[PDB]
């Protein structure tokens, strides 16, 4: 039987790549950063509170102009917030109320959302009719969508619950690329600043880097204990940190193909819902299930500060491209902007 | 503030008014969750994801029948955690899959995000169970060793008073689910066992009554009357 031979070959491959990773591990990030001045205590304060949602908020995405927002809730409404004046620019009704993701196009013309309906809907914000219309209903996934990203306003990357990701052509609506290789439900997506590489976490404690142009999985990282919930790249684009359900965040490196740091505490035993990075990548933010968001230091693996004020589960986070604001959604229908 | 800003604030006020009205209309209704195994008649309990709407005594409901997704339910169950109640349907005629149903029910009862939701049980296909146990070809004791020493609680639910072996069989199967439910839960949520025939239509009233008790219990806990 070829099964035994193939399993032995796979085991040998795993052993030799583990040895190769051990060969390059001549130091540790925590020891290298021991000589660096710590970030110290950080005290951020709520500046605005965006009321108007009447149900649990599931996703949020900052605009590329650093002023507009998109929030999705089980109420069935998509609301665009003028973050400076808290005005609701748009209120987009949804055919299906079970939405778990939202995305704001880099050009600002389009907004996307999806969830337990297996369709990624596209809304054209800037039209001469004056209202918000449905541009494309992207069907083809056999599982609930988890995260959507816009790629140059013409390509759309979607990850669903059927253990696969895809690349879409908005103009025609057909999948130009399908990404397979995950065994558990894919839960997050993140596009690198080069807009050429992206990674996805799944319910398998595995993070895989995908080449969107060729459609074949390039890298794979493992080491978490339970389901992966959120992934975001470092601003430099050569590294990324992931958040899992086992109450810890791990920082991964694409070049080193290793874990670099573990973000956990003895007093933290709750799941992690969203992860984001600062403008410089020095500050790491994570939205936990203790109704609060901690502020981790990406180089010292300590808690520089805590974001509290939500009386329910924190669901979505995000740092604006200007780096001047942080919006933290939660399950009490309240968006708070911290800076 | 300039004229553009004032007009934008007026537009935002109109948007907020519309959102408040829609939220009020949405809050005036009740939502449930439908779960069960195959061949359990979930779609015929009441006569991407299937949704059903029915109204009882000027109170309308929404059943979210999920069949599009595969057996993987551990991760998307977080959406249905603010619902009023969960309808759990079991095909009690077939004894081979009862253990799977018991295991499935236990996981949903002990689910972390489902720790405050009352579960409503619908043991379906009562007529099939009655004829199956009356034939005598298949015996429950072959699958459940506890069925022999279990005794009837000397309470007769049916009015016509059929064969007590059927009544003993029905109570034992119901007793398994009741014991599983009462093993843990701290009393935050309770089970509502029921026996529904395949052709039975008196299900909306049972759902309506059970939802009334659940909301009454919820009000008692929140109004500090405990």
């Amino acid at each position: 039987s070829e099964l035994d031979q193939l399993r032995q070959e796979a085991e040998q491959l795993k052993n030799q790549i583990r040895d190769a990773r051990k060969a390059c591990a001549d130091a540790t990030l925590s020891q290298i950063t021991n000589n660096i001045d710590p970030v110290g205590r950080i005290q951020m304060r709520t500046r605005r509170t965006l009321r108007g949602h009447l149900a649990k908020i599931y996703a949020m995405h900052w605009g590329t102009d650093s002023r507009l927002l998109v929030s999705a809730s089980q109420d069935g409404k998509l609301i665009i917030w003028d973050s400076y004046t808290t005005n609701k620019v748009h209120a987009i009704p949804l055919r299906s109320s079970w939405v778990m993701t939202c995305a704001y196009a880099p050009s600002g013309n389009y907004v996307a959302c999806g969830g337990l309906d297996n369709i990624c809907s596209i809304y054209n914000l800037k039209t001469r009719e004056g209202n918000v219309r449905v541009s494309r209903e992207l069907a083809g996934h056999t599982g609930y969508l988890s995260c959507c990203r816009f790629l140059d306003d013409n390509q759309i990357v979607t990850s669903s619950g059927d253990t696969t990701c895809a690349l879409w052509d908005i103009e025609t609506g057909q999948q130009t690329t399908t990404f397979t290789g995950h065994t558990g439900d894919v839960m997050s997506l993140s596009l690198a600043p080069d807009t050429r590489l992206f990674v996805s976490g799944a319910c398998d404690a595995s993070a895989k880097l995908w080449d969107v142009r060729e459609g074949m999985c390039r890298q794979t990282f493992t080491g978490h204990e339970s389901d992966i919930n959120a992934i975001c790249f470092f601003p430099n684009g050569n590294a990324f940190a992931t958040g899992s359900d086992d109450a810890t965040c791990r920082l991964f490196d694409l070049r080193a193909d290793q874990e670099l740091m573990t973000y956990s505490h003895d007093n933290i035993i709750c799941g992690i819902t969203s992860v984001s990075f600062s403008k410089s990548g020095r500050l790491l933010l994570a939205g936990y299930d203790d109704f609060n968001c901690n502020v981790w230091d990406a180089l010292k693996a300590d808690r520089a500060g805590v974001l509290a004020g939500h009386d329910n589960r924190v669901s979505c986070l995000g740092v604006t491209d200007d780096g001047m604001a942080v919006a933290t959604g939660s399950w009490d229908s309240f968006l708070k902007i911290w800076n | 503030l300039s004229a553009e800003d004032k007009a934008a604030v007026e537009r935002s006020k109109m948007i907020d008014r519309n959102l408040r009205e829609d939220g009020e209309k949405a809050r005036r209704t009740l939502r449930l969750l439908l779960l069960g195994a195959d061949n359990s008649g979930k779609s015929t309990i009441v006569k991407g994801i299937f949704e059903t709407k029915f109204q009882v005594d000027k109170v309308n409901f929404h059943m979210f029948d999920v069949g599009g997704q595969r057996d993987e339910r551990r991760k998307w169950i977080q959406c249905f955690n603010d619902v009023t109640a969960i309808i759990f349907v079991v095909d009690s005629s077939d004894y081979n899959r009862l253990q799977e149903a018991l295991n499935d029910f236990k996981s949903i009862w002990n689910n972390r995000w489902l720790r405050t939701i009352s579960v409503i049980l619908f043991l379906n296909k009562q007529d099939l169970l009655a004829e199956k146990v009356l034939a005598g070809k298949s015996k429950i004791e072959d699958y459940f060793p506890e069925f022999a020493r279990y005794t009837t609680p000397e309470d007769a639910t049916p009015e016509p008073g059929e064969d007590p072996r059927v009544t003993r069989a029905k109570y034992f199967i119901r007793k398994e689910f009741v014991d599983i439910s009462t093993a843990s839960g701290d009393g935050r949520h309770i089970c509502y066992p029921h026996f529904t025939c395949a052709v039975d239509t008196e299900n909306a009233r049972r759902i309506f009554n059970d939802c009334k008790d659940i909301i009454l219990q919820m009000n008692l806990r929140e109004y500090n009357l405990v």
Epitope: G130, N131 | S2, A3, E4, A7, A8, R11, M14
Partner: single-chain antibody, 234 residues
Framework: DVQLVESGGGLVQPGGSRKLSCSAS????????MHWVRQAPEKGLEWVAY????????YYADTVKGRFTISRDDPKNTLFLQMTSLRSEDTAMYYC??????????????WGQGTTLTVSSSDIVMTQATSSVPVTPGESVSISCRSS???????????LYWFLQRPGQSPQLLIY???NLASGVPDRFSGSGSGTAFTLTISRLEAEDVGVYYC?????????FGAGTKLELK
């Protein structure tokens, strides 16, 4: 698909009455505020009134305050203007203008055909730099406007607007807030300026750029227009 057709023309004696109606189609009328803009044959554009979304705040011009009634019918998607106390000054051309206000909206992107009303027989003032300058196609022509007060608001937005009127056609929006080109306008027009001094720049002129250019302020009501610069082909 955006259409605006007016009605209620004819000849009226002074002191009479007339009802004007601007019918809107092809867009969400309930979400768009509307204006009335008056143009005398020999004077230029002049603001009249304004109705907000869903019959909200209503504004009237000082010269016509208390004599006109503006009504909105969202189900019918039509504007209503009531004309009372008619005089010889009101003999002019009346247009209905689409308008919408949010963070990045274009509030004067569309104009109606207009209707003809003939009658038988403080504020911010902007002065147009010139009324007539000959031009030759292929070169650049710069048009400047001045305002009696600085239009730069505390939020950083200035409210200068540029309107081009074809001979015999309704005016259109070129640039709003002196820097943003309206949709459909070719990238040959540009605007700049600060405080009270502003300029409108055209890269190269074509046969379609012959008309009269108006500078308008939207800082505070009432809205005012410039005298108008007319470009003559030469």
């Amino acid at each position: 698909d955006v259409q605006l057709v007016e009605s209620g023309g004819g000849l009226v004696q002074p002191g009479g009455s007339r009802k004007l109606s601007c019918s809107a189609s092809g867009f969400a009328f309930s979400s768009f505020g509307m204006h009335w803009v008056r143009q005398a044959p020999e004077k230029g554009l002049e603001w009249v009134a304004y109705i907000s979304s869903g019959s909200g705040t209503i504004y009237y011009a000082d010269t016509v305050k208390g004599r006109f009634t503006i009504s909105r019918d969202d189900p019918k998607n039509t504007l209503f203007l009531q004309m009372t106390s008619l005089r010889s000054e009101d003999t002019a051309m009346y247009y209905c203008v689409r308008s919408i206000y949010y963070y990045g909206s274009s509030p004067f992107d569309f104009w109606g055909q207009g209707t003809t009303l003939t009658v038988s027989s403080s504020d911010i003032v902007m002065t147009q730099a010139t009324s007539s300058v000959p031009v030759t196609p292929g070169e650049s022509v710069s048009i400047s406007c001045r305002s009696s007060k600085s239009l730069l608001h505390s939020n950083g937005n200035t409210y200068l607007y540029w309107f081009l009127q074809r001979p015999g056609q309704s005016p259109q929006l070129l640039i709003y807030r002196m820097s943003n080109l309206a949709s459909g306008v070719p990238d040959r027009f540009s605007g700049s300026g600060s405080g009270t001094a502003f300029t409108l720049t055209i890269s190269r002129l074509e046969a379609e750029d012959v008309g009269v250019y108006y500078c308008m302020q939207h800082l505070e009501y009432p809205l005012t227009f410039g005298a108008g610069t007319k470009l003559e082909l030469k």
